[PDB]
Design a protein around this ligand. Structure first.
Ligand code: KNJ
Lengths: 99, 99
């Protein structure tokens, strides 16, 4: 689709067998989701931005469906205020910024 | 242009006659720039990011160029980690997300 930016660009995602709402975020390098279970091994990571850093769990090779488009990549899980789809998965669904 | 997301979507902006680097950030409602001098009166705002909240100074009706595109709108100034062009100005330059 073409998504305008008058309001937050929220979409439905399917991850880990669950439906969530998430923000398409070109400012985020990484994808970070509120607390949930995911399969496989993980390792701790710190991610930062406005207000500083939070500690998350990094899971690799996670699938995911974003607004009906599948992909695979790293998903960070932790105390994010907002579920965020970052560039690592936006590329895979073919998302670009156009003006 | 069409900006892909394999790298950070960094552009040059012009504000106060000076060129700066900034990030096109669909996850940001507002535009936040590092400490600088802007004319006029300001109002207080708090904004929440990944790590918590910061206090910023809100300046309205500021002339700003984004990747050569002229905008006039609200600019927040404060301890952001990078200069962020948020949706308030992305809409002025006609930006959309597309996939
Ligand atoms: C993996 C990450 C999300 C870490 N990256 C980052 O945090 C990067 N940023 C991003 O990815 C930004 O899009 C974030 C996303 C976000 C939204 C709501 C809660 C938390 C975080 N937005 C913000 O930090 C603040 O955005 C605003 C919001 C959400 C509301 C208002 N009113 C004003 C602003 C500026 C801004 S700083 C950055 C490093 C460029």
């Amino acid at each position: 689709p073409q998504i305008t930016l008058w309001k937050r660009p929220l979409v439905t995602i399917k991850i880990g067998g669950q439906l969530k709402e998430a923000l398409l975020d070109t400012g985020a390098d990484d994808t970070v989701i509120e607390e949930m279970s995911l399969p496989g091994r993980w390792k701790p990571k710190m991610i930062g931005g406005i207000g500083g850093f939070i500690k998350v769990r990094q899971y690799d090779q996670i699938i995911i469906e974003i607004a009906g488009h599948k992909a695979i990549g790293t998903v960070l899980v932790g105390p994010t205020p907002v579920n965020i789809i970052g560039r690592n998965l936006l590329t895979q669904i073919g998302a670009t910024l156009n003006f």
